[PDB]
Every structure is written in C-alpha cells, then in structure tokens.
Amino acid sequence: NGPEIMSKLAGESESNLRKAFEEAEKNAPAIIFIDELDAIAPKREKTHGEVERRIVSQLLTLMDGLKQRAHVIVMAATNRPNSIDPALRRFGRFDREVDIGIPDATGRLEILQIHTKNMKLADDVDLEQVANETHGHVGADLAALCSEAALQAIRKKMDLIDLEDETIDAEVMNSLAVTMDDFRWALSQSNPSALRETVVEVPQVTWEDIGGLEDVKRELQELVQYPVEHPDKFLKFGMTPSKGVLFYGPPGCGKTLLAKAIANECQAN
Amino acid sequence: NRPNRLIVDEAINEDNSVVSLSQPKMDELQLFRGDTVLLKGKKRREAVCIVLSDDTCSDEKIRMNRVVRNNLRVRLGDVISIQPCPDVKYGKRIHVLPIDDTVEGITGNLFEVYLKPYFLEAYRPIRKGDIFLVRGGMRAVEFKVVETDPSPYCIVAPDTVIHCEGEPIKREDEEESLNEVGYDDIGGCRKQLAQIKEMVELPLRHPALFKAIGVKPPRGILLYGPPGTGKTLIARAVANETGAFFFLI
Numbered sequence: 001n002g003p004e005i006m007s008k009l010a011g012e013s014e015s016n017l018r019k020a021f022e023e024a025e026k027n028a029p030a031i032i033f034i035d036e037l038d039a040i041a042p043k044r045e046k047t048h049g050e051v052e053r054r055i056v057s058q059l060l061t062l063m064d065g066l067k068q069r070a071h072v073i074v075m076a077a078t079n080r081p082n083s084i085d086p087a088l089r090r091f092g093r094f095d096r097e098v099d100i101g102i103p104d105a106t107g108r109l110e111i112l113q114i115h116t117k118n119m120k121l122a123d124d125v126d127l128e129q130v131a132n133e134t135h136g137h138v139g140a141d142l143a144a145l146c147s148e149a150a151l152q153a154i155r156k157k158m159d160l161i162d163l164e165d166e167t168i169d170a171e172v173m174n175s176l177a178v179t180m181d182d183f184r185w186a187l188s189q190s191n192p193s194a195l196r197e198t199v200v201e202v203p204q205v206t207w208e209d210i211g212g213l214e215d216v217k218r219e220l221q222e223l224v225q226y227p228v229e230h231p232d233k234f235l236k237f238g239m240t241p242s243k244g245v246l247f248y249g250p251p252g253c254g255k256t257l258l259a260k261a262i263a264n265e266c267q268a269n
Numbered sequence: 270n271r272p273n274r275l276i277v278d279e280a281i282n283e284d285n286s287v288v289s290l291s292q293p294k295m296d297e298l299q300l301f302r303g304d305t306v307l308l309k310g311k312k313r314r315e316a317v318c319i320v321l322s323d324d325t326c327s328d329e330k331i332r333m334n335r336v337v338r339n340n341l342r343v344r345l346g347d348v349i350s351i352q353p354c355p356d357v358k359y360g361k362r363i364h365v366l367p368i369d370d371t372v373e374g375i376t377g378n379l380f381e382v383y384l385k386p387y388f389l390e391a392y393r394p395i396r397k398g399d400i401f402l403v404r405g406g407m408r409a410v411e412f413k414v415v416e417t418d419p420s421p422y423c424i425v426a427p428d429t430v431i432h433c434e435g436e437p438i439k440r441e442d443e444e445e446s447l448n449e450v451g452y453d454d455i456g457g458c459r460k461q462l463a464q465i466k467e468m469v470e471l472p473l474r475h476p477a478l479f480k481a482i483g484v485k486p487p488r489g490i491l492l493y494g495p496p497g498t499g500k501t502l503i504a505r506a507v508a509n510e511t512g513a514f515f516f517l518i
C-alpha cells in the first residue's frame with residue numbers, strides 16, 4: 001500500500017519496499033500489488049519532496065531487479081495512467097496497462113448480484129432495473145449501495161421489532177429480507193456517485209430504437225462493421241478502410257442514436 | 270597470413286582431452302606428445318589437454334572436440350591459435366565435481382562411481398574452463414571448474430585428496446555463455462550504430478595508440494530518444510563487442 005509504504009521514515013520506507021520485494025521473490029510465483037501507485041510514484045516534475053523521488057527510484061530499482069532475476073508479477077493501481085511517473089510505464093517495467101474502467105449496465109448488474117449473493121433479498125429487487133437505473137456508480141459504489149440497503153432493512157426491522165421482548169437470536173436475523181424500497185432509498189438519498197468523466201460502455205440503443213434513415217443505417221453498418229467484420233476483404237483490395245464519418249443535418253434527427261446503435265451492433269464501447 | 274590461424278571443424282573422439290594434429294602443421298609447430306598444447310581462441314577460454322589423437326581428417330581444419338566450441342568459441346568457421354605449452358607443474362590435483370545431471374540419481378561420492386575410470390594414465394592435462402563429457406553410464410554429464418589450489422593448470426597424480434562436498438548446480442555457467450549483446454541485436458539505428466562505432470573505435474580498441482597522440486577523445490555520448498529504443502542495449506552491445514568494461518550506472 002502506497003500510504004503503508006511512505007507512511008514510515010524514508011529509510012524505513014525503502015527498507016519496507018526492499019523487504020516486500022525480497023519476500024515476493026522468495027515466494028515465487030508471487031504477485032506484488034501496489035494500490036495508489038500515484039502516492040508512491042507521482043509525476044517526476046511534480047514530486048516535490050526528495051524523499052518521494054528516492055522512494056520512486058527505490059521502487060524502480062526493485063522492480064528492475066525483479067525483471068533481471070525473479071518470478072514475480074507486479075501490479076499497480078492508480079486513478080489515471082498519466083498520474084504516475086512516466087518512467088514507471090517504461091518498457092520492461094510496466095509494459096501493459098489494463099484500463100479497469102467503469103462497469104456498464106450489465107457490469108453493474110453483475111456487481112449487484114455478487115454483493116447480494118449472501119444477502120437475503122426479496123423478489124421485488126429487480127436488479128436489472130436497478131442496474132439500468134444505476135449510473136455513475138462503480139464497483140465499491142455499488143457495494144456501498146448494497147450495504148446501505150441492508151442497513152436500512154436492519155434499522156427498519158431490528159430497531160422496531162426486538163426492543164424489550166428477549167435477546168436477539170438467529171431466527172430473527174435470518175428472517176431479514178431486503179426490499180425494493182431499500183434499494184430505491186439507497187439510490188436516491190444515501191449514495192454519492194463518484195463518476196463524472198466520460199462513460200465507456202456498449203450503449204443499449206439498437207437499430208430498432210431508431211426510426212427511418214435506412215440508407216444511412218446501411219451505409220454506417222458498412223463503414224463500421226465491414227472493416228472490423230471482414231478485415232480480409234479490405235486487405236485484399238488496395239484501399240485503407242475509413243476511420244471516421246461525419247453526421248450533418250438538422251438537430252433532432254438522431255445522430256447520437258445512430259452512433260449508439262452502430263456501437264451496439266458491433267458490441268463496441 | 271598467421272600460420273597458426275586455421276579453421277576448426279568436426280570431431281569424432283568423444284573425449285575432450287584429445288586435441289588434434291596436422292603433420293604438415295606439426296612440422297611447423299613444435300607440437301610434442303605429452304600433457305598440453307595451448308590452443309587459444311576467443312574470450313581467453315581455451316581447451317588445453319593431451320594432443321595428437323587425430324590426423325584422420327584433412328588438413329587446414331584442425332579437429333577439435335565439438336564441446337570446445339560452446340567454450341573457447343561459438344560456432345564453426347572460427348580459428349584456433351595452437352601453440353604448445355607442455356610440461357606444466359604437477360600441483361596437488363584438479364577439482365573433481367559435476368554440475369547439473371548428477372543429483373538426478375545415486376550421488377555417492379560423485380567421483381568413484383562414474384568419473385574415476387577416466388583419469389587413468391592421462392592424468393588431466395587441462396585448463397580451468399575446459400568443459401567436456403565424462404561418465405560411467407549414459408555418457409552425458411559435464412565436468413566443470415569449481416576449485417583451484419594451483420593457479421595455473423597442472424597434471425594430476427594419485428594419492429591426492431579431493432572433496433566432492435560440492436553440489437551440482439544450475440546453468441549459471443550456461444547463462445554466462447548466453448550474454449554479451451552484440452551488433453546483431455541492434456536494429457533500426459544502423460546509421461546511429463555506425464556513428465557510435467566510428468566514435469568509440471579509436472578510444473577503446475586502440476588505447477595506447479590514442480595515448481600516443483594528444484587529441485581530445487569523445488568522452489561524452491548523449492544517446493537521446495524515446496524510451497525503449499535500445500539505448501542501454503546499444504551501449505551494452507558496443508561495450509561487449511569492443512571489449513570495453515561496461516558499468517551500468
């Protein structure tokens with residue numbers, strides 16, 4: 001952990017990093033994960049303190065030592081790839097960067113199902129509707145949503161039922177059920193959406209969602225699918241496929257839906 | 270034009286301790302039968318041992334046990350500089366210990382089971398770095414250098430003492446062989462590679478020559494470009510091929 005690493009003294013932080021890398025090498029095959037890598041490794045022009053630069057260099061040397069002689073895979077977590085030092089993303093050190101991104105409607109549905117696996121939830125939950133409604137919530141946001149729904153159910157049941165009767169037992173707790181109203185309240189009142197940047201998902205708008213423009217639909221289907229569905233045909237001819245199209249016309253004709261539908265047809269973000 | 274500059278070719282005697290002859294060449298050399306002939310090649314590692322178990326093949330290509338290619342050489346087309354240096358001292362004895370394929374199975378003493386039947390009346394005229402095959406069985410195991418009581422190589426004798434306490438290891442030696450990046454590993458910077466060559470050939474390949482003259486050498490090189498363009502690879506290849514000592518700061 002970045003805070004765990006640079007929470008201690010500079011020499012102590014470097015010693016902790018070296019000890020962690022040595023333990024990972026000893027336990028090969030091992031995975032080194034560094035969440036909040038931007039905390040340890042900021043931009044080189046931005047890292048004000050000399051201690052921070054020294055820690056960055058120590059991490060670089062330790063991972064290079066892993067590269068030359070080890071069997072450890074290093075993973076890192078950061079808000080943005082550019083927030084970390086560009087020297088970190090140097091070839092040999094961080095060759096491949098995986099964009100975790102944001103979950104889509106299906107992804108939010110999967111996350112909610114995962115978090116409700118051990119949660120006794122009623123039949124009115126309709127998690128498909130919740131996920132379709134859920135926007136701006138990513139992962140732990142949906143986890144907090146499920147936790148809020150469960151806590152509201154508990155505060156509705158325990159705080160109003162078992163007060164002076166007799167001490168709580170397993171029968172009352174296992175009888176707890178989470179309803180749709182709890183999920184609605186979690187969505188509305190008690191959930192801060194931490195997502196405000198661009199959305200990267202396959203849009204749910206299909207061709208049936210658009211009326212008319214059949215010729216435009218066919219032309220766009222060509223220009224998009226054909227380069228990606230039949231690359232061999234394009235390679236056979238001496239023409240490079242076009243990588244862009246412009247939609248022009250009166251506002252309100254569905255250019256946005258045209259883009260969404262062509263993305264959905266190709267199952268492309 | 271150097272007389273002892275001759276190719277080396279295929280070999281048939283599975284024992285490395287044998288080094289070939291070429292009677293027309295022996296007349297050129299003083300090659301005597303006995304312990305050793307100093308056959309010199311690349312990287313200073315040689316295959317020095319008993320001699321004259323050859324002349325079965327044609328001339329102009331010395332027969333040298335193929336196992337002295339990986340050592341002392343790389344591939345075919347190379348050249349040997351064979352010059353006798355017999356009558357070496359007789360120190361205690363030369364190390365006995367295997368390296369890779371002996372822990373696989375009965376180990377015992379690692380000397381008196383498989384290797385003992387070979388240091389017989391040919392008591393190891395050798396040079397530390399000569400690697401070969403010797404066994405009392407499947408006939409494929411190495412014999413490497415581990416210890417050195419006498420710095421120069423010698424001819425062993427019985428009554429000596431040996432300690433196989435050592436353990437067979439991994440291919441640290443094989444990895445050592447696999448190193449020293451070269452110009453064959455550089456691509457996309459042919460003009461830059463030639464510029465670097467013409468900059469560093471005189472200061473490195475000819476140190477005393479440049480010390481004779483009073484010109485200023487290029488002692489600072491700024492390889493700048495995008496990350497991952499082989500800058501450290503280019504530097505390592507240049508230093509290794511030219512023989513200059515490379516320090517990776």
Ligand SMILES: Nc1ncnc2c1ncn2[C@@H]1O[C@H](COP(=O)(O)OP(=O)(O)OP(=O)(O)O)[C@@H](O)[C@H]1O
Nearest residue numbers: 092454455456457495496497498499500501502503
């Ligand atoms: N021009 C090149 N030709 C061949 N291989 C290259 C070239 N550039 C880089 N490589 C290969 O890239 C791999 C990793 O690169 P390496 O560790 O040598 O650093 P580098 O490319 O010199 O880095 P930098 O540009 O940051 O100094 C090595 O296997 C090396 O062989």
